[PDB]
């Protein structure tokens, strides 16, 4: 009990980085992996990211002058909603990227 | 509560940019030529520009070879790897000594890796429930699971594998988890303090309530050599059967 | 455990183990809202204690029946005393302009009938100056519906304020920490 | 006559005096009597030397006062006196601009009794009776002082605001929507000033000799020592030894008040003949029952539950803005770090989307609200909010507390 | 019961005494054991002395008592000794 406490502090997931290869050949075949790798490179998840980036940047260019301000989220009738939608789309986009 | 053994009186070569040494500095006195050569060699080392350099020094006992070695090891800092081991340790038993020398060369070379990871964490509420669409009995693939944390609660459903991870952790409604979304499994912080005190005694730790917003995100930087990766890959890490 | 140890299939239920030295010779029993936790008698007692807590001294100490009737639907005989009311005509002798500037209407009479009306919230309930639903939208407009706990409980020490080395009594069931407090707990709390 | 006059009514005292002036007129709306038959005035108890027994016959009942023969006379004794209350004077009221900001939380019949006694006995002309909570957001209109505190980490008046007024008899919470309150959510915390006095005296009865007769003793010690825990409960008790006072009792005959010698200060090597009650383990019981009333063995959940219910009652059109506009007023919020602790525990309760904005003035917030309304009435907003002299007789006055100047107008 | 919170293995010390005379007729037989003496609860800063052998064999294998008793540790590796060096240094510093 005096040792195992720094586990989550500085753990880098080796399995998530695909370095447990010696234990991955039990249910792996070459053609399936190559087909997936060919049909992996972007081209499926960056499109909606750009779609949301478009609306985020167009609302931030002019309507984003006082959008995200918390005082605007305090003293206003629509800028609070502008802050809410700006933070919502920011979280959506960075979650999609990750 | 201190122990000094023929060392800890040395902290560096004590040089400058112009290769000028100091007569009494860093626990080293004298040896102008040796200090100049060591400074030049460590300056070449710091550039990471080469590999396989070698040098032999002729020094009698107590002349200061080990002191120079320790000083040069401290020149590059704790993070730069080093493994000065006795020459009689080569003659091992369970592995041929040339293989050991290759293993030491593998250990010596360093690297710095990193990874960014997210994680969610007590449980506010719980609502469990897809169709078989055929001859299958049923299809359970989504369950809303609460996530209390401290700074805000954000319940969310994911792949069912996270649900079976919840049963694997055997966490109650008033139990805190630490679920790194990279794998969908569970890391257990422990029980919670809110739904606690159900009894006067508990061997299981009550565990402090998690601090911060539930959708935790962080990045980790670790300097790990390659031989650790080799030995980790050599042996299995999981399994459930005999 | 001791592998393949002596056992005769006597109980061995993982959640049943009852033993004693036989001073009573018995065995184990067999056969987030506070409104859905305990009954109403104890909450009524707590409300009565809190209404006594409202009472500050001899002036309101016997006012508990009035407070109870309000909630459930020379010390307190109203602020009318001649040593307070009839004297105040000279207590402002520093300077004042007490003058009659008012006509003669039923409002002017209500200035005096309501002045020393000897009327309370209880009389308001017993009178028709306000209708029935006004007292409801005065009472029910305040109380909540279901949210009773969203952060845990503290359960502080009853007499002292200790946080650790805590323990309850055998039969009183009152929270305490120091065994020193038990000396007065089994005498005035148990 | 342009300048108005502002009265800040309440359930223990009122803040009267002209809106032009910025200094308080504290009329202590609470009578009493001593242990020798007769009865004192409203604001002469402090000068007497009888602290052995106390009897508190105030006009205010549990919630509100329900008689007017002497308390209206007390209001005359305070308002109508221009000698002790220099400069300020309400000679008759014929053209006087009074805003008697009554506790509109009273019954409409109470509102009408007040309205009749001010329109006939005072014979008033100008009136716009709304709670001071209506007039608090006037800080932005002029140069206003306020500490901007966020709990995320350790007309011309402002439009949106949710308010929490605190007092002696009661403490209430209300969302003032767009400047008009939403009295369908009139919330009250069951504890109050007299409740706190009783709690302290009962807790110290188990710690020292009787304070039930000497309740003013408890009042003084509460004034001098009690405060809100900076962070939490357990973190405050773990080092009670470094802050454990010793109340030195007053010389009951000659001394006006007692005092306390501080373990943190060696400046007082002077003892007293009267015994010293060692105040050791009773400080932290009180400040938490404001946040966690179960310590006071009551069915009241807590201020966190009440405020989250109040905000959830409000729609997203204002509720994020409503948390973005929160002000706590009243005397009890002069207790240090109440706002910071409340904001921190709410930010714990509040999810990661609602930014926190809680504003509490430094000092007695009742006086701050009174002076904010004084500045309000210095401006013309009341002058379009007042009622003319011809708005009382030709129609039943009850209509005024039904559609215009009554809590049912804002339910 | 010398119970430990982070153990889960409650140790029973035998029998114990009350301060009651039980019933009226002849009785109180068969009672001669050690009675609890100390407080109901008190902290014990228990000191244990172990060598680097036990710590290293714990590091090498999930179970370490078997190799400590039987004696088949199995030539534990160097990074174990390095991490134990760092851990002991910081434990002394803490
Ligand atoms: N030039 C020097 N200045 C200070 N100390 C020295 C010097 N040379 C040697 N020493 C000290 O002498 C001790 C023994 O040296 P040693 O390691 O036996 O030298 P060598 O490796 O040449 O045999 C070391 O602890 C070191 O601190
Ligand atoms: N610094 C302070 N800390 C705590 N409470 C305070 C402080 N200053 C004033 N108060 C409280 O504020 C109350 C004044 O409120 P008031 O409006 O007179 O009550 P009511 O409306 O019931 O007549 C006092 O009873 C007092 O307990
Ligand atoms: F008038 Be109170 F006590 F809020
Ligand atoms: Mg107030
Ligand atoms: Zn105690
Ligand atoms: Zn008991």
Curated annotation (Swiss-Prot), chain B:
Residues that, per the record, bind ATP: 59-66
Reaction it catalyzes: ATP + H2O = ADP + phosphate + H(+)
GO process terms (BP): box C/D snoRNP assembly; chromatin remodeling; DNA repair; protein stabilization; regulation of DNA-templated transcription; regulation of transcription by RNA polymerase II
Subcellular location(s) of the protein: Nucleus
GO molecular function: 5'-3' DNA helicase activity; ATP binding; ATP hydrolysis activity; DNA helicase activity
Record keywords, A-Z: Acetylation, Activator, ATP-binding, Chromatin regulator, DNA damage, DNA repair, Helicase, Hydrolase, Nucleotide-binding, Nucleus, Transcription, Transcription regulation
Family per similarity comment: Belongs to the RuvB family.
Protein name: RuvB-like protein 1
Source organism: Saccharomyces cerevisiae (strain ATCC 204508 / S288c)
From Swiss-Prot, chain C:
GO cellular component terms, A-Z: chromatin; nucleus; Swr1 complex
Zinc finger feature spans (HIT-type): 157-190
TM regions (residue ranges): none
Key words of the record: Chromatin regulator, Metal-binding, Nucleus, Zinc, Zinc-finger
Statement: the UniProt record of this protein carries the keyword S-adenosyl-L-methionine: no
Keyword DNA repair: no
Function per UniProt: Participates in the catalytic exchange of histone H2A for the H2A variant HZT1, an euchromatin-specific factor, leading to chromatin remodeling and changes in transcription of targeted genes. Indirectly involved in vacuolar protein sorting.
Subcellular location: Nucleus
Gene Ontology BP terms: chromatin remodeling; protein targeting to vacuole; regulation of DNA-templated transcription
Name under which the protein is recorded: Vacuolar protein sorting-associated protein 71
Gene Ontology molecular function terms on file: nucleosome binding; zinc ion binding
InterPro entries assigned: Vps71/ZNHIT1 (IPR039723), Znf_HIT (IPR007529)
Binding site for Zn(2+) 1: 157, 160, 177, 181
UniProtKB/Swiss-Prot annotation, chain D:
A GO cellular component annotation in the UniProt record: Swr1 complex
Protein's UniProt keywords contain Cytoplasm: yes
Major location (coarse): cytoplasm
Keywords: Activator, Chromatin regulator, Cytoplasm, Nucleus, Transcription, Transcription regulation
Alphabetical list of Pfam families matching this protein: Actin (PF00022)
Subunit composition and interactions: Component of the SWR1 chromatin remodeling complex composed of at least ACT1, ARP4, RVB1, RVB2, ARP6, YAF9, VPS71, VPS72, SWC3, SWC4, SWC5, SWC7 and SWR1, and perhaps BDF1.
Extra information: Present with 238 molecules/cell in log phase SD medium.
Family the entry assigns: Belongs to the actin family. ARP6 subfamily.
Purpose of the protein: Component of the SWR1 complex which mediates the ATP-dependent exchange of histone H2A for the H2A variant HZT1 leading to transcriptional regulation of selected genes by chromatin remodeling. Involved in chromosome stability.
Protein name stated in the entry: Actin-like protein ARP6
Recorded name of the encoding gene: ARP6
Swiss-Prot record, chain E:
Leader sequence segment: none
Subcellular location field: Nucleus, Nucleoplasm
Chain segments annotated as coiled-coil in the UniProt record: none
General function of this protein: DNA helicase which participates in several chromatin remodeling complexes, including the SWR1 and the INO80 complexes. The SWR1 complex mediates the ATP-dependent exchange of histone H2A for the H2A variant HZT1 leading to transcriptional regulation of selected genes by chromatin remodeling. The INO80 complex remodels chromatin by shifting nucleosomes. Its ability to induce transcription of some phosphate-responsive genes is modulated by inositol polyphosphates. The INO80 complex is involved in DNA repair by associating to 'Ser-129' phosphorylated H2A histones as a response to DNA damage.
SUBUNIT field: Probably forms a homohexamer. Interacts with RVB1 and may form heterododecamers with RVB1. Component of the SWR1 chromatin remodeling complex composed of at least ACT1, ARP4, RVB1, RVB2, ARP6, YAF9, VPS71, VPS72, SWC3, SWC4, SWC5, SWC7 and SWR1, and perhaps BDF1. Component of the chromatin-remodeling INO80 complex, at least composed of ARP4, ARP5, ARP8, RVB1, RVB2, TAF14, NHP10, IES1, IES3, IES4, IES6, ACT1, IES2, IES5 and INO80. Also belongs to the R2TP complex composed of at least RVB1, RVB2, TAH1 and PIH1. Interacts with SPT15/TBP.
Family of this protein: Belongs to the RuvB family.
Extra facts: Present with 3030 molecules/cell in log phase SD medium.
């Amino acid at each position: 009990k005096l040792f195992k406490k720094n586990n989550q502090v500085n753990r880098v997931d080796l399995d998530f980085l695909n370095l447990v290869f010696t234990l991955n050949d039990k249910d792996l075949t070459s053609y399936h992996a190559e087909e997936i790798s060919k049909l992996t490179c972007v081209k499926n998840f960056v499109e909606e990211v750009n779609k949301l980036r478009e609306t985020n940047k167009q609302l931030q260019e002019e309507f984003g002058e006082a959008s995200f301000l918390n005082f605007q989220d305090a003293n206003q009738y629509f800028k609070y909603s502008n802050k809410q939608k700006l933070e919502g789309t920011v979280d959506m986009l960075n979650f999609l990227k990750m | 509560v201190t122990r000094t053994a023929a060392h800890t009186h040395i902290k560096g070569l004590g040089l400058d940019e112009s290769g000028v040494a100091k007569r009494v500095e860093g626990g080293f006195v004298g040896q102008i030529e040796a200090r100049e050569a060591c400074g030049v060699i460590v300056d070449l080392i710091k550039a990471k520009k080469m590999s396989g350099r070698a040098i032999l020094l002729a020094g009698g006992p107590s002349t200061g070879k080990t002191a120079l070695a320790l000083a040069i090891s401290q020149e590059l800092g704790p993070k730069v790897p080093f493994c000065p081991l006795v020459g009689s340790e080569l003659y091992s038993v369970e592995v041929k000594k040339t293989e050991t020398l290759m293993e030491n060369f593998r250990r010596a070379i360093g690297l710095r890796i990193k990874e960014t990871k997210e994680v969610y964490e007590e449980v506010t509420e719980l609502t469990p429930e897809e169709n078989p669409l055929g001859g299958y009995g049923k299809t359970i693939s989504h369950v809303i699971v609460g996530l209390k944390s401290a700074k805000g609660t954000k319940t969310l459903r994911l792949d069912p594998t996270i649900y079976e991870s919840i049963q694997r952790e055997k966490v109650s409604i008033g139990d805190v988890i630490y679920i790194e979304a990279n794998t969908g499994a569970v890391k257990r912080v422990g029980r919670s303090d809110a739904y606690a005190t159900e009894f006067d005694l508990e061997t299981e730790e009550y565990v402090p309530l998690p601090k911060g917003e539930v959708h935790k995100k962080k990045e980790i930087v670790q300097d790990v050599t390659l031989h650790d990766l080799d030995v980790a890959n050599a042996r299995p890490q999981g399994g459930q059967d005999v | 455990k001791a592998l393949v140890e002596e056992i005769d299939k006597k109980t061995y239920n993982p959640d049943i183990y009852f033993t004693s030295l036989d001073p009573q010779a018995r065995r184990y029993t067999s056969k987030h809202s506070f409104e859905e936790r305990y009954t109403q008698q104890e909450i009524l007692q707590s409300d009565r204690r809190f209404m006594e807590l409202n009472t500050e001294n001899f002036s309101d100490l016997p006012n508990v029946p009035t407070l109870l009737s309000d909630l459930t639907g020379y010390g307190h005989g109203w602020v009318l005393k001649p040593e307070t009311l009839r004297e105040i005509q000279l207590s402002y002798k520093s300077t004042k302009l007490p003058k009659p500037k008012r006509k003669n209407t039923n409002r002017i009479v209500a200035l005096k009938k309501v002045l020393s009306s000897k009327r309370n919230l209880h009389s308001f309930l017993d009178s028709a100056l306000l209708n029935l639903m006004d007292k409801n939208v005065i009472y029910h407009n305040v109380y909540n519906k279901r949210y009773f706990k969203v952060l845990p409980l503290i359960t502080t020490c009853s007499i002292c304020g200790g946080y650790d080395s805590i323990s309850s009594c055998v039969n009183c069931g009152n929270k305490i920490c120091s065994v020193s407090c038990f000396k007065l707990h089994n005498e005035t709390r148990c | 006559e342009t300048p108005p006059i502002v009265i800040d009514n309440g359930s223990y005292e009122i803040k009267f005096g002209p809106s032009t002036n910025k200094k308080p007129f504290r009329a202590l709306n609470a009578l009493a009597k001593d242990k020798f038959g007769t009865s004192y005035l409203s604001n002469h108890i402090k000068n007497i030397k009888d602290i052995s027994s106390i009897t508190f016959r105030r006009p205010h009942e549990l919630g509100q006062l329900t008689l007017w023969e002497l308390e209206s006379c007390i209001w005359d004794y305070c308002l109508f006196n221009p000698s002790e209350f220099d400069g300020f004077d309400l000679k008759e009221g014929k053209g006087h601009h009074l805003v008697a900001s009554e506790s509109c939380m009273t019954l409409p019949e109470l509102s009408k009794h007040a309205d009749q006694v001010i329109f006939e006995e005072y014979e008033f002309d100008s009136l716009f009776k709304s709670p001071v909570a209506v007039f608090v957001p006037f800080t932005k209109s002029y140069k206003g002082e306020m500490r901007t505190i966020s709990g995320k980490d350790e007309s011309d008046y402002h439009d949106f605001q949710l308010v929490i007024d605190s007092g002696f008899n009661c403490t209430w919470i209300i969302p003032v929507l767009k400047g008009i309150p939403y009295y369908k959510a009139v919330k009250k915390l069951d504890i109050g000033g007299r409740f706190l006095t009783g709690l302290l005296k009962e807790t110290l009865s188990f710690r020292h000799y009787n304070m039930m007769d000497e309740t003013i003793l408890v009042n003084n010690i509460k004034e001098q020592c009690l405060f809100v825990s900076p962070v939490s409960y357990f973190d405050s008790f773990k080092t009670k030894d470094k802050h454990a006072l010793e109340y030195v009792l007053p010389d009951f005959q000659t001394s006006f008040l007692g005092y306390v010698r501080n373990p943190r200060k060696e400046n007082v090597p002077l003892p007293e003949d009267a015994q010293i009650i060692t105040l050791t383990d009773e400080l932290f019981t009180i400040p938490e029952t404001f946040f966690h009333p179960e310590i006071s063995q009551i069915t009241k959940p807590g201020i966190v539950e009440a405020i989250l219910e109040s905000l959830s009652m409000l729609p997203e059109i204002v509720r994020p803005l409503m948390v973005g506009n929160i002000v706590c007023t009243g005397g009890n919020f002069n207790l240090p770090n109440f706002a910071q602790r409340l904001a921190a525990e709410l930010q714990r309760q509040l999810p990661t989307d609602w930014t926190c904005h809680v504003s509490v003035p430094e000092g007695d917030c009742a006086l701050f609200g009174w002076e904010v309304m004084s500045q309000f009435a210095k401006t013309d907003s009341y002058r379009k909010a007042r009622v003319t002299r011809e708005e009382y007789y030709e129609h039943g006055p009850d209509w005024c507390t039904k559609h215009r100047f009554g809590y049912q107008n804002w339910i | 019961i010398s119970i430990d919170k982070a153990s889960g293995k409650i140790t029973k010390l035998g029998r114990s005494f009350a301060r009651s005379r039980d019933y009226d007729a002849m009785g109180a037989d068969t009672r001669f054991v050690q009675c609890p003496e100390g407080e109901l609860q008190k902290r014990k800063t228990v000191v244990h002395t172990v060598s680097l052998h036990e710590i290293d064999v714990i590091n090498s294998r999930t179970q370490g008592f078997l190799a400590l008793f039987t004696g088949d540790t199995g030539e534990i590796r160097s990074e174990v000794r390095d991490q134990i060096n760092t851990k002991v240094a910081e434990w002394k510093e803490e």
